[PDB]
Structure formats: C-alpha cells, structure tokens
Design a protein around this ligand. Structure first.
Ligand code: CLA
Ligand code: CLA
Ligand code: CLA
Ligand code: CLA
Ligand code: CLA
Ligand code: CLA
Ligand SMILES: CCCCCCCCCCCCCCCCCC(=O)OC[C@H](CO[C@@H]1O[C@H](CO)[C@H](O)[C@H](O)[C@H]1O)OC(=O)CCCCCCCCCCCCCCCCC
Ligand SMILES: CCCCCCCCCCCCCCCC(=O)OC[C@H](COP(=O)(O)OC[C@@H](O)CO)OC(=O)CCCCCCCCCCCCCCC
Ligand SMILES: CC1=C(/C=C/C(C)=C/C=C/C(C)=C/C=C/C=C(C)/C=C/C=C(C)/C=C/C2=C(C)CCCC2(C)C)C(C)(C)CCC1
Ligand SMILES: CCCCCCCCCCCCO[C@@H]1O[C@H](CO)[C@@H](O[C@H]2O[C@H](CO)[C@@H](O)[C@H](O)[C@H]2O)[C@H](O)[C@H]1O
Ligand SMILES: CCCCCCCS[C@@H]1O[C@H](CO)[C@@H](O)[C@H](O)[C@H]1O
Ligand SMILES: CCCCCCCS[C@@H]1O[C@H](CO)[C@@H](O)[C@H](O)[C@H]1O
Ligand SMILES: CCCCCCCS[C@@H]1O[C@H](CO)[C@@H](O)[C@H](O)[C@H]1O
Ligand SMILES: [Ca+2]
Ligand SMILES: [Ca+2]
Lengths: 60, 37, 64, 34, 40, 30, 136, 504, 34, 30
C-alpha cells in the first residue's frame, strides 16, 4: 500500500501455504510499468513488489 | 488347507495410482498448514 | 464342509434360510408398533424441546 | 515460527501411509500375468 | 393433569391423523374407481 | 522445517505431473 | 496416593520432654511434651546420582560442562537441614511396682529435603510407646 | 480384478471369514479402549478435582469409566479426591488391562475363524451353499441384547448387583457414583432425571426380550422378505447403518445440551450454562442469601466454593475452542490454580459498575462497563481523541471479595483495565501457564470434541445408509442396465403403469 | 524427558521406508503367475 | 512419545513372531 508497511508473503519469511502470497506491487507505483530494469537494484525491486507485475503480465 | 473359493485378485491401474497420489499430495498440501498451526 | 461339536448343536438355528410366512403375515401388527413408536419418539422429542410441558417434569439440571 | 511439534510427523505419515498403500497395490497389479 | 401443551400435543396428533386419514381415504377411493387395465 | 515440508510436497506434485503426462498409460483403440 | 514417595528421618534425637508440675507419682494421667532435633535425612558424605555432594563429591553438573550454573545452583550446592520436631506421650498404663509405663505418642516433624533440592513435607507420626524408669 | 474400494466384498458369501473380520474389528476397538485408558492414566493429574478435573485435561475415556462406577486407581486415589481407597480389581487400570486381554483373545479367535472358514454350520442344509438365516439371527441377537439391556438396568444401575451411575447436584459440585432407582412416572422421560435412565433399560430390555422371542419364533411375511431383500446380508448393513447414525445424532445432542448421562464433572459444563448465566445466577443467589443473613461482603463472597466460581468462567465453555487448537483446555488458558476472588468495579462516584461479558460467538470483545440499569459508565476506548468514558476519566477502581485477592483494592488504571479484560470472561482465576507452555488461546472440552466427532460421523453414516440401501434394492443392475432394455418401458404412453409390461 | 524433537520422525521413517520397500516387493511376488 | 515409540516397535516385533511361526511358508518335500 505504498506506506512503508511491508507485508510478508513468502514461506521463508514466516508464511504457510494458506497465508503465503506474492504480494501486489506498491501503491506508490500505481499503474506505472515497473520491470526489473526500472529499479536501482533487485533489493529495491523486491521491496516494491516487482515480482507481482512480472508474474501477472507474463501469466496473462 | 483346501483353498477358499471366495478369494479374488485386486487391481490398481496406473491412472488410478496417479489420481490417488494427486489426491493424497494435494490433501497434504492443504492440511499441512493446519497440522503445523 | 467341517462339522464340529458346537456346529452340530447350533445347526438348527441356521437351517431355515429363505423361510417366510404367507402373504402379508404380521405386517398390520408391525405397522401398529411402528406408529406407536413414532408417537413415542415425538413425545420424548417434544419434552426435551419444551414443546410438550408436563406437570412435575422440569427439563433442566435444576430439579433433575 | 512456533509451530506444532507433531505437525511434521502428522504431515509425513498423512502422505506416506496412503501413498504406500497405493504403490503396493499398483506394483502387484503390474506383476500379474499379462 | 392435562396441561395446555399436552392438550396442544393431542390437537396436533389428531390433526396429523386427520390429514393422513383423509389423504389415504381419497387415494384409495380414486385407485378403486380408476383401475389399470390388464390383459387376462 | 515447515518450509521444507511445503516445498517437498509441491515438488512431489510437479514430479507427479511429469510422470502422469509422459509416463501415462497410452490410450489404445481396440 | 498416586505414588509420591516421602522419605523421612523418623527420630527423637536430643529429645527433651517434660510432664505437668506436681507429678508425685506417674499415673495414667501423666503426659510428656517436648521437642527434638531433625537433622538432614542424608548426612554430609552422601553423593547424588551425578556424584555431587556436600562434604564430598563434585560441585557442578560435570556432564553439562558449558551449561550456565545459576539455574542448577539448588541442585549443585548441597545444604544440610536441621529443624525441630515436637512430640507428646500420653501415658495409658503404669506398673507402679516395676517402674514400667506405656501409652500412645504423636510426633510432628519435617521429611527429607534431599539436601536442599526441594521443600520438605510435614509429617505426623502416631504410635505406641514403652518406657522403664529406674532410680539412678 | 477387484477395484481397491471393493476388496472387502470377498466376505459377502463367506460367513466364517466375515465373522473373523468382525472379530478383528472388535479386537482393534477393544485394544483402542485399553490403549486410550493407559495413555490417559499416564498423563492424568488426579491431585485437584476442583480446578483441574479430568475435562480440563483432555480426558476422553476416563469420564466414561467414571460414569458407570469406575472411580479409583490401584495407586490409591479416586476421581472425587479421596486418598487411601481400595477399588478392587476394577480400577481404571484393571478396566484397561481387561480390554487389552479381551483384544488378544478376540485376535486369536479371528485367526481360528479365518483358517477354519468352511464350517458346515454356514451351509444351507438343502443346497450346500453358504447361507445365513438373517431373520432368525436377528431374533437371537435381539433377545440377547434385551437380556443384557435389562440386566444392566436392573442390577448395575440400581446398585442391586453393581455400582450404580454418576449423579450430581444441579451445579456439579458434589458428584459421585450412586445406586439409582427407576422412575416409573412421566418424569422418567426427562433427560435430566437419572431414574429414567434406569427405567429405560429395565423396560426397553423386557421389550427387547419379548420382541426377540417374537423374531425367533415368527418368520417374516413373504411380502416384507421380498421387499426388504431379507436373503441379502447387505440389507442388514443398510438398516443397521441407519440405526447407528440415528443413535450417533442422539448422543451428539445429549452431549451438547446436557443430560443425566453427560454430567458436567465428567465432560465439563455446557455452552448453554454460559448463555443463560446459569452459574452466575446461583453465585449471586448464595451471596445475597449470605448478605441477608448479616454476612459482610468479604464473608459472602468467601463462602462461594471455588468449584462453583470456576464454572462461571468462559474458559470452561465448550463453544470457545478451535478445530486445530489441539489438546487439553489447560494448554490454552493454563492450569487453573486458584480463584482470585470476585472483582467489583466502581467509578469515582462510588457506583458499582459491571463489565459486559463476552458471548461465546466472539473471539475478541471490547471492555464496556455499565451501572445496574445497563447505562454505559466506562470503557476502554480504541480511538482516544474523543474518549469520554475512559477508566482514567471516570476514576474506575476494582476491589476483590473472596479468593486470593480478598480485601484488596486497585486504583492504578493499567492494573484496573487488566482485571476488566479478565472480567469479560466471567470469574477471574490464577493460572499456571508455564508447566504446559500454554499459549493463552481457548480450547474446547471433551464435551465439545465428543459432539463434533459424533455429529460428523453420524452425517457421514447417512451416506453409508443411502449407499448400501441402494446396493441392496438395485443389486440386479449393479453392473449396468439390461443391454436389451425395452424402449417401450422408458418411453411414455406404452404402459399404463410405469415399468409394468402387463399394463399394455 | 528432553529428547531430540526429530527423534520420533527419524525412528518412524527408519521403520516405515525400508519396511514398505519389502512389503511392496513381497506382495508383487505373491501376485505373479504361479 | 518416546515410551510409545519403544513399546510400539516391541509390539510389532511380537506380532512378527506370530506371523513368522504360524503363517510361515510351510516346508514341503518334493
Ligand atoms: C514470448 C516471449 C516473451 C514475451 C511476449 C515477454 C513479455 C514481457 N516481458 Mg519477459 N522474458 C522472456 C520472454 C517473454 N517476455 C524470457 C524467455 C525471459 C528470460 C530471458 C524473460 C525475462 C523478462 C524479465 C526479467 C522481465 C521481462 C518483462 C516483460 C514485459 C516487458 C517486455 C518489454 O518491455 O519488451 C519491450 C519490447 C518491445 C516493446 C518491442 C516489441 C517489438 C514487436 C515486434 C513490436 C510490436 C509489439 C506490439 C505490442 C504488437 C503485439 C500484437 C501481436 C501481433 C503480438 C513483457 C510482459 C519485464 C516485466 O515483467 O515487467 C513487469 C521484466 O522485468 N521478461
Ligand atoms: C465384555 C464386556 C464389556 C464391559 C463390561 C465393558 C465396559 C466398559 N467399556 Mg468396553 N468394549 C467391549 C466389552 C466390554 N466393555 C468390547 C467387546 C469392545 C469392542 C467393541 C469394547 C470397546 C470399548 C470402547 C471403544 C470403550 C469401551 C468403554 C468401556 C467403559 C464404559 C462403557 C460404556 O459407556 O458403554 C456405553 C454403551 C452403550 C451406550 C451401548 C449402546 C447400545 C446400542 C444403543 C444398542 C443398539 C442395538 C440394540 C440391538 C437395539 C435394541 C435394544 C433392545 C433392548 C430394545 C466400561 C468400563 C469406554 C471406555 O471408557 O474405555 C476405556 C470406551 O470408550 N469399551
Ligand atoms: C417407562 C419406560 C421407559 C423410560 C422411563 C424411558 C426413558 C428414556 N428413553 Mg426409552 N424406551 C422404552 C422405555 C422407556 N424409556 C421402550 C419400551 C422402548 C422400545 C425399545 C424405548 C426406546 C427408546 C429409544 C429409541 C430412545 C429412548 C430414549 C429414552 C430417554 C429419553 C430422554 C432423552 O434423552 O431423549 C433424547 C432422544 C430424543 C429426544 C429422540 C430424538 C428423535 C430424533 C429427533 C428423530 C430423528 C432422527 C433422525 C436421524 C433425523 C435427525 C436430523 C438431525 C440431524 C437434524 C429416556 C432415558 C431416547 C434416548 O436414548 O435418549 C438418550 C431414545 O432415542 N427410549
Ligand atoms: C471419537 C473420536 C475421538 C474424540 C472426540 C477424541 C477427543 C480428544 N482426544 Mg483422543 N484419540 C482418538 C479418538 C478421539 N479423541 C483416536 C482414534 C486416537 C488414536 C489416534 C486418539 C489419541 C489421542 C491422543 C494421543 C490425545 C488425544 C487427545 C484428545 C483430546 C483433544 C482432541 C484434539 O485436540 O483433537 C484435534 C482434532 C483435529 C485436529 C481434527 C482432525 C481433522 C482431520 C485431520 C480431518 C481429515 C480430513 C480428511 C483428510 C478429508 C478427506 C477428504 C476426501 C474424502 C476427499 C480430546 C478430548 C489429547 C489429550 O488431551 O489427551 C489427554 C491427546 O494428547 N486423543
Ligand atoms: C458398519 C459400517 C460399514 C461396513 C461394514 C461397510 C462395508 C462395505 N462398504 Mg460401506 N460405507 C459406510 C459404512 C460401512 N460400509 C459409510 C459410513 C460410508 C460413507 C463414508 C460408506 C460408503 C461406501 C462406498 C461409497 C462403498 C462402500 C463399499 C463397501 C463394501 C467394500 C468395502 C471395502 O472394500 O473398502 C476398502 C477400503 C479401503 C481399502 C481403505 C479405506 C480407507 C478409508 C477411506 C480411510 C481411512 C479409514 C479408517 C481406517 C477408518 C476408521 C473408521 C472409524 C473412524 C469409523 C463393504 C461391503 C463399496 C461397495 O459398495 O463395494 C461393492 C463402495 O463402493 N461403502
Ligand atoms: C433423505 C432421507 C432418506 C432416503 C432417501 C432414504 C432411503 C431409503 N431408505 Mg432410509 N432412513 C432415513 C432416511 C432416508 N432413507 C432416516 C432418517 C431413518 C431413521 C434412522 C431411515 C431408516 C431406514 C431403515 C431402517 C431402512 C431404510 C431403507 C431405505 C431404502 C428403502 C426406502 C425406505 O425405506 O424409506 C423409508 C422412509 C422414509 C425415510 C420417509 C419417512 C417419513 C417420515 C415417517 C415422516 C415423519 C413426519 C414427522 C413425524 C413429523 C413430525 C416432525 C417433528 C420434528 C415435529 C431407501 C434406500 C430400508 C432399506 O435399506 O431397504 C433395503 C430400510 O430397511 N431407511
Ligand atoms: C496409520 C496411522 C496414520 C498415522 C497418522 C496420520 C496423520 C494423522 C493426521 C491427524 C492430525 C491430527 C492433528 C495434528 C496436530 C496434532 O499434533 O494433534 C495432537 C493431538 C493431541 O494434542 C496435543 O496434546 C498434548 C497433551 O496431551 C499437548 O497439549 C499438545 O500441545 C497438543 O497438540 O492429538 C489428537 O488429539 C488426535 C485425535 C483427535 C480425535 C478428534 C476426533 C474428531 C475427528 C473427526 C474427523 C472426521 C473427518 C472426516 C472427513 C471425511
Ligand atoms: C488408520 C490407517 C488408515 C490407512 C488408510 C490408507 C488408505 C487410504 C487412502 C485411499 C486413497 C484412495 C485414492 C484412490 C484414487 C483412485 O483410484 O481413483 C481412480 C478410481 C478409478 O476406479 P475404477 O473403477 O476405474 O477401477 C480401476 C481400479 O484399478 C482401481 O482400483 O476411482 C476411485 O477410486 C473413486 C475415488 C476417486 C477420487 C479421485 C480424486 C482425484 C482428484 C484429484 C484431487 C486433488 C486435486 C484437487 C485440485 C483442486
Ligand atoms: C495377542 C494376545 C495378547 C495381547 C494383546 C495385545 C497386546 C493387544 C493390544 C492391542 C492394541 C494396543 C490395540 C490398539 C488399537 C488402536 C487402534 C485401532 C487405533 C485406531 C486409530 C484410528 C482409526 C484413528 C483415526 C484418526 C486419526 C489417526 C486422526 C484423527 C481422526 C481419526 C480419529 C479418524 C494377550 C497377552 C493379552 C493374551 C492373548 C494373546
Ligand atoms: C504402512 C502402510 C501399509 C499398507 C499395507 C497395505 C497392504 C495391502 C496388501 C495387498 C494384498 C494383495 O494380495 C495379493 O493379491 C494378489 C492378487 O491381487 C494375489 O495374487 C493371486 O492373483 C494373481 C492374479 O490372478 C495370480 O497371478 C497369483 O498367482 C495369485 O496368487 C496374491 O496372492 C495376494 O498376496
Ligand atoms: C496394565 C496396568 C499397568 C499398571 C499401571 C501402573 C500401576 S497404576 C499407576 O501407578 C502410578 C504410580 O503410583 C500412578 O501415578 C498412576 O496414577 C496409576 O495409574
Ligand atoms: C489378571 C490378574 C487378576 C488379579 C485379580 C486380583 C483380585 S483383587 C480383589 O478383587 C475383588 C473383586 O474386585 C475386590 O473386591 C477385592 O477388594 C480385591 O482385593
Ligand atoms: C497489570 C497486569 C497484571 C494484573 C493481573 C492480570 C489479570 S489476572 C492474570 O491473568 C493472566 C492471563 O489469564 C493469568 O495467566 C494469570 O494467572 C493472572 O495472574
Ligand atoms: Ca493418659
Ligand atoms: Ca510460554
């Protein structure tokens, strides 16, 4: 939600199958296209929910 | 002993094996979170 | 098949497979007992449900 | 995470016991004469 | 004694018996009037 | 331990998909 | 009931017990009341199953060489108990010719504390007694 | 070959091996009972039937042994808190041992009947085919069931030759095993009257004996033999499954609502005693009676038994659990140690205030305090900026009467609020949360777990009934419909009566 | 007693896995054409 | 749980004794 309140979705970060998720990209991004190469680093890309966009666009 | 005439062979074909393993594994994937709680 | 002492004693108890009384036999009497039993179950259900409330019958822990 | 300590063996036997049942039955079907 | 709800229980019992009795009386009468035809 | 368990079950399912497709009983017309 | 075992050192060690005043003769009305010492049920050499003791033995849990010691202090550091017990003797019979008396007693004392490892229990002991008195 | 879900149909025409399979099932069930009792004895703490009774400890078979008169251990304790009792052989341990030995003997009998399956007894004397005369078997077994039912009621439950049954006062404070005389009037049909349980077994037993004799002596009418397929053992499976799911729904119901056979000292209180404030009303009655007799408030509340206060606490309500919150209730709120006493809240004006109690529906619940007329006087706010009723603004204090905290008053707002949070659960207790590493989350009692399993199994057995009733009445088409099925039988207008070729 | 928390599943799988292997082999031997 | 495990294995061994003796492959002279 773009308010610097990160939601944990992955198994290794404390989730089980029922609670786990790939979390949607940041509200600060909005509808902006956020590929890996728009981030300064993978660490930034991950914080802002880059995986969600890559996955849903390739999936669709 | 004289043989029992009521015996019958039992079968599980390969598709049934695959279906059954899928059922078990998916049920495990589903209930395991609740077993760990 | 194997005969045994105990099996010979019990033989007459397992010897009438398929034996029936003619026609409807005691079906009418059976229906009467079924109807009485339906009314019995309805009574005990309605007592437990507090739909049927009887003098001296307090359906509660209090006054057992 | 503070999970149930029996969750691991519960899940393991939940998978293994019925899976093994099916594998026993499948393999002895294949070994029957064709 | 016969409580109000025991009287009510009897009314319900009688009402159900009347419904079932009239239903079967009517069905039995119609079944006798309008019989299936079978070849001898 | 929980993560290993979840990923293990998932991996078995993916393996099962592979055998169920490529090592199925072949359909045969008789 | 339920199996818990209560060891105790049943004792009248160093008993000092007195009657009522004006006992010109001991009768079936005479009573004794007094106190005694209850020393530790095990004495100082006793070693626990891991070899720890007070006057002998290890002073640590040697099978846990790098465990923290504060949590084991009560098991590691043996202590020697010394408490008081109380007893009453009720004379029920007297042989005036022979100087023999008999009756019932009730005593109260603490049980074994396993050299400080746990709290003792309170015990009440009832039974019979006999005593022969002689001029000295 | 046979598909996996049909392997046991090899027994249908093999009475000897069917008996062996039934013996093996019986051996397994009796072995479970013995094993379960031993596991419970290895874990049960008998030291406090007041605040740590069996139903707080996840005990499932212990209450069933106690219900019928097994109350002592060979180690000297009894479930009512006695010491130095001698139960004789029939202690909890002796019951468990008897079930293990029975299990072994049934196992051996199963082996014999499996090997020596081909007994002449199982053959029809006319045809030499395997054959069971099920109508007469039903009479024999019904007669036996009636004799056993009658004897249980007339000898065991009455104490005439046996121990009796568990009975208690209406608040579950003084339960014990007692002889019980039958109640022959209409109050015998009151579920809460134990004498009706006794009368039922006497009367139903006699009826079973009479009906058993009828079914031994009178053959089924031809029309019923044919309609119910009484030559097919699967018809018995169908109707037996139906009777069993009926009985299972009944025991689920009487466990959830309570009856003379589901007493609260063995299975815990019911959810409805919380819904109706059953125990709170009796507590208030006793306190008011003490006050009317000139007791002080501390004396009135100190006269409340801790066992009675403990029932007036939502952590013992069986509708507060969770499906995967496993184990004993003690694993949740903890092992109850002591009543803290009755908390009386007051505001700065000195008006007595009452914490609104949590209904069973709510996993969480706010803290709201009213006066005796239900007017809100204080609460714990969520948003603070427009708070009007905070404990700080209203000067809320809490004083305790009876229990550990008797005579004490707290004025520090965080402390007062902490006690108010506990008061939504009813009476306040001190718990040992360390011994079991309790997590603070409510679990249900054996009353809840019994009810869940038996309602579920009952519903599942409805399917079994439907399935085996269908198999019975449709045996001729189990492998498919007639390959030469007359299209005139399924098209309209050919036959006057559906499916009757004699109707043109 | 403070035993190893994986001791139970270790023992269960130690028993189960090789026992199941043998049972599979035995049953599919019995089912072969005699 | 440990005690259950030890007794379970022991009980399985006693059962195995039973089958190995009374349900052995019968020795046959040919
Ligand atoms: C069919 C193969 C395929 C397709 C369609 C995509 C598509 C995409 N990838 Mg993926 N990718 C692929 C294979 C593919 N990928 C493979 C094999 C890898 C591993 C090397 C990756 C690794 C990868 C990463 C790491 C990322 C993407 C991303 C993207 C998105 C941005 C792509 C972009 O900017 O292209 C730009 C190129 C053009 C605009 C040129 C187009 C040239 C054509 C000829 C012009 C006409 C296009 C027009 C729309 C016509 C369409 C109509 C019809 C005729 C097709 C887009 C959803 C990014 C993403 O997910 O962001 C959220 C991202 O970060 N891809
Ligand atoms: C040999 C005699 C015997 C005796 C004296 C006992 C005694 C006991 N059993 Mg054990 N048991 C036995 C054999 C016995 N058992 C066998 C053979 C098995 C294997 C099936 C078991 C399996 C078993 C289990 C699984 C459990 C016990 C338990 C117990 C205890 C409570 C019993 C109870 O609540 O029953 C309640 C009995 C009923 C409610 C009977 C229902 C009868 C139905 C409704 C009749 C329906 C059909 C009938 C024909 C209808 C017509 C009736 C007619 C009169 C009109 C008690 C110590 C409990 C325990 O505490 O274990 C430690 C327990 O959980 N037993
Ligand atoms: C004077 C003699 C006498 C006395 C005092 C009793 C006393 C009693 N009888 Mg017994 N009885 C007797 C003679 C006697 N009986 C005789 C001669 C017979 C013929 C053998 C019976 C047959 C009998 C049966 C079948 C039952 C009783 C039951 C009872 C108990 C009733 C209170 C109760 O808990 O009901 C609770 C039970 C009900 C209120 C009945 C519920 C009926 C349901 C609603 C029918 C539909 C069920 C179906 C599966 C649908 C469920 C759907 C659902 C999931 C929503 C009470 C102990 C009942 C019992 O065992 O209770 C524990 C019971 O079920 N008796
Ligand atoms: C009628 C059956 C029954 C009931 C009501 C109880 C009740 C109780 N047991 Mg006992 N127990 C039983 C049978 C039962 N037990 C059996 C058969 C065994 C041998 C395994 C035991 C061994 C046992 C032990 C070792 C212990 C208990 C304990 C307890 C207490 C806690 C229960 C709990 O946490 O459950 C939790 C219940 C669940 C988590 C529900 C499981 C739901 C399953 C997994 C659903 C499966 C769905 C299925 C896969 C779907 C297939 C779909 C497909 C068809 C498409 C409670 C009093 C505990 C206790 O406190 O002891 C003092 C305890 O330690 N029980
Ligand atoms: C007294 C109870 C009872 C009995 C004696 C039977 C007996 C039978 N059933 Mg029926 N049935 C029942 C109740 C019963 N059923 C109930 C409650 C249901 C709904 C769940 C059914 C639904 C049903 C169906 C849909 C079918 C049968 C079939 C059969 C026949 C073959 C059984 C077999 O080979 O399974 C072999 C079973 C296995 C190899 C493994 C089963 C594993 C289960 C699913 C999981 C774990 C079970 C666990 C050990 C059980 C503990 C039970 C306890 C909690 C009660 C046999 C005549 C079959 C039939 O009609 O064949 C012609 C068939 O297709 N039954
Ligand atoms: C969905 C419900 C349903 C269905 C489709 C079936 C279907 C079947 N049953 Mg089963 N059965 C059921 C529920 C059902 N049953 C219930 C709840 C019980 C009581 C435990 C039974 C007990 C039973 C037995 C003992 C037998 C069957 C048999 C059969 C088969 C033959 C038909 C039959 O006898 O119907 C029976 C009729 C009905 C289910 C309808 C009854 C309608 C009642 C009398 C109306 C009552 C109104 C009530 C008094 C109003 C007051 C309500 C109160 C709350 C105020 C057929 C497979 C037989 C079989 O298997 O043959 C091989 C067999 O022997 N059934
Ligand atoms: C061959 C045997 C197969 C081996 C087992 C296979 C896997 C079993 C999976 C069951 C999981 C059970 C819970 C797992 C978590 C756990 O550890 O529980 C563990 C619990 C015990 O709970 C433990 O108790 C301890 C103190 O005794 C501590 O408090 C622990 O913290 C506590 O977890 O075990 C049980 O209670 C199991 C029996 C309960 C029976 C309830 C009856 C209701 C069932 C009806 C279901 C019908 C569904 C039909 C659908 C179609
Ligand atoms: C206490 C100890 C208890 C131990 C119990 C051990 C055994 C219990 C396990 C039994 C499992 C049986 C499985 C049989 C599996 C099997 O054999 O299926 C195939 C089988 C086909 O049978 P046929 O009549 O064609 O016969 C072929 C024969 O070879 C079968 O023996 O149909 C069924 O068994 C009916 C049930 C179907 C269930 C199918 C479900 C598949 C869907 C997948 C669901 C998961 C994905 C969901 C995605 C959202
Ligand atoms: C031989 C012999 C003997 C012995 C015996 C024995 C030792 C026995 C045992 C037995 C036993 C010891 C048994 C046991 C059993 C058990 C069981 C049978 C169980 C079952 C279970 C189940 C079935 C479960 C299920 C489930 C689950 C798992 C989960 C949840 C859900 C449910 C519940 C469903 C003697 C010496 C005496 C003598 C004679 C000979
Ligand atoms: C911990 C999980 C444990 C799960 C254990 C599950 C065990 C299941 C045991 C299955 C038993 C199979 O039982 C097995 O059936 C096959 C047929 O199917 C029989 O085999 C029989 O039929 C076949 C086929 O006509 C003939 O070729 C063969 O000569 C004959 O003996 C075997 O004699 C028997 O041993
Ligand atoms: C087959 C029955 C085996 C007998 C079980 C052991 C004796 S009985 C056993 O004794 C313990 C110690 O006194 C008690 O704590 C426990 O409550 C009691 O069940
Ligand atoms: C399998 C071993 C059986 C051991 C038998 C010990 C009997 S013990 C005996 O039993 C009587 C009847 O219960 C009791 O009344 C009596 O008090 C008790 O001492
Ligand atoms: C200021 C907080 C402390 C004041 C007392 C809190 C209410 S009471 C408190 O509640 C805990 C949870 O149930 C129990 O585990 C514990 O036994 C009990 O002391
Ligand atoms: Ca004296
Ligand atoms: Ca803790």
């Amino acid at each position: 939600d773009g308010i610097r309140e990160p939601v944990s979705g992955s198994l290794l970060y404390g989730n089980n199958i029922i609670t786990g998720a790939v979390v949607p990209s940041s509200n600060a991004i909005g509808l902006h296209f956020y590929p890996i190469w728009e981030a300064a680093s993978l660490d930034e890309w991950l914080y802002n929910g880059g995986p969600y966009q890559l996955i849903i666009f390739h999936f669709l | 002993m004289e043989p029992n005439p009521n015996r019958q062979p039992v079968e599980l074909n390969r598709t049934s094996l695959y279906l059954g393993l899928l059922l078990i594994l998916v049920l495990a994937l589903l209930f395991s979170s609740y077993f760990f709680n | 098949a194997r005969r045994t002492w105990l099996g010979d004693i019990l033989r007459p108890l397992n010897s009438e497979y398929g034996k029936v009384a003619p026609g409807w036999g005691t079906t009418p009497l059976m229906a009467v007992f079924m109807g009485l039993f339906l009314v019995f179950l309805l009574i005990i259900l309605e007592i437990y449900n507090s739909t049927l409330i009887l003098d001296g019958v307090n359906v509660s822990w209090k006054a057992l | 995470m503070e999970v149930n300590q029996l969750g691991l063996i519960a899940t393991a036997l939940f998978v293994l016991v019925p899976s093994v049942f099916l594998i026993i039955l499948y393999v002895q079907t294949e070994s029957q004469q064709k | 004694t016969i409580t109000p709800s025991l009287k009510g229980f009897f009314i319900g019992l009688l009402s159900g018996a009347v419904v079932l009795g009239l239903t079967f009386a009517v069905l039995i009468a119609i079944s006798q009037i309008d019989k299936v035809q079978r070849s001898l | 331990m929980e993560t290993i368990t979840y990923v293990f079950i998932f991996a078995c399912i993916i393996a099962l998909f592979f055998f169920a497709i490529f090592f199925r009983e072949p359909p045969r017309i008789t | 009931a339920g199996g818990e075992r209560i060891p105790l050192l049943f004792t009248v060690k160093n008993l000092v017990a007195s009657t009522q005043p004006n006992v010109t003769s001991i009768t079936t009305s005479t009573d004794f009341k007094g106190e005694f010492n209850v020393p530790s049920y095990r004495t100082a050499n006793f070693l626990d199953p891991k070899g720890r003791g007070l006057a002998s033995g290890y002073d640590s849990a040697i099978a846990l060489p790098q465990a923290k010691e504060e949590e084991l202090a009560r098991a590691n550091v043996k202590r020697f108990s010394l408490t008081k017990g109380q007893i009453s003797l009720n004379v029920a019979k007297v042989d005036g010719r022979t100087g023999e008396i008999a009756g019932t007693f009730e005593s109260e004392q603490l049980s074994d504390d396993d050299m400080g490892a746990h709290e003792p229990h309170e015990v009440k002991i009832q039974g019979v007694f006999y005593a022969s008195i002689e001029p000295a | 070959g046979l598909p996996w879900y049909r392997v046991h149909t090899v027994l249908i025409n093999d009475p000897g091996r069917l008996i062996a399979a039934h013996l093996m099932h019986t051996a397994l069930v009796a072995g479970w009972a013995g094993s379960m009792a031993l596991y419970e004895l290895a874990t049960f703490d008998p030291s406090d039937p007041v605040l740590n009774p069996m139903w707080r400890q996840g005990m499932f078979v212990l209450p069933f042994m106690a219900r019928l008169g097994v109350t002592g251990s060979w180690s000297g304790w009894s479930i009512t808190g006695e010491t130095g009792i001698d139960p004789g052989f029939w202690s909890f341990e002796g019951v468990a041992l008897a079930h293990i030995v029975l299990s072994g003997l049934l196992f051996l009998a199963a082996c014999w009947h499996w090997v020596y399956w081909d007994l002449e007894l199982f053959r029809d004397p006319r045809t030499g085919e395997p054959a069971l005369d099920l109508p007469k078997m039903f009479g024999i077994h019904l007669f036996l069931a009636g004799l056993l039912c009658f004897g249980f009621g007339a000898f065991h439950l009455t104490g005439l030759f046996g121990p009796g049954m568990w009975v208690s006062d209406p608040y579950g404070l003084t339960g014990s095993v007692q002889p019980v005389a039958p109640e022959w009037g209409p109050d015998g049909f009151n579920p809460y009257n134990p004498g009706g349980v006794v009368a039922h077994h006497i009367a139903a037993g006699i009826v079973g004996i009479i009906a058993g004799l009828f079914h031994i002596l009178v053959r089924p009418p031809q029309r019923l033999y044919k309609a119910l397929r009484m030559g097919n053992i699967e018809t018995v499976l169908s109707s037996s499954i139906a009777a069993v799911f009926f009985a299972a729904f009944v025991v689920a119901g009487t466990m959830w609502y309570g009856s003379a056979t589901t007493p609260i000292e063995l299975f815990g209180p019911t959810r409805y005693q919380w819904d109706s404030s059953y125990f709170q009303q009796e507590i208030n009655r006793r306190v008011q009676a003490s006050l009317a007799s000139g007791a002080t408030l501390e004396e009135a509340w100190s006269a409340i038994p801790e066992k009675l206060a403990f029932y007036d606490y939502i952590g013992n309500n069986p509708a507060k659990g969770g499906l995967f919150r496993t184990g004993p209730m003690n694993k949740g709120d903890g092992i109850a140690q002591a009543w803290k006493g009755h908390a009386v809240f007051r505001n700065k004006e000195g008006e007595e205030l009452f914490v609104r109690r949590m209904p069973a529906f709510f996993e969480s619940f706010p803290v709201i305090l009213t006066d005796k007329n239900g007017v809100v006087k204080a609460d714990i706010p969520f948003r603070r900026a427009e708070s009007k009723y905070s404990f700080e603004q209203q000067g809320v204090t809490v004083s305790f009467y009876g229990g550990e905290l008797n005579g004490q008053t707290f004025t520090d707002p965080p402390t007062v609020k902490s006690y108010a949070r506990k008061a939504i659960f009813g009476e306040i207790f001190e718990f040992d949360t360390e011994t079991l590493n309790s997590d603070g989350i409510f679990r249900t009692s054996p009353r809840g777990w019994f009810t869940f399993a038996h309602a579920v199994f009952a519903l599942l057995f409805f399917f079994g009934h439907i399935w085996h009733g269908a198999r019975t009445l449709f045996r001729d088409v189990f492998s498919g419909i007639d390959p030469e099925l007359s299209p005139e039988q399924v098209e309209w207008g050919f036959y006057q009566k559906v499916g009757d070729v004699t109707t043109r």
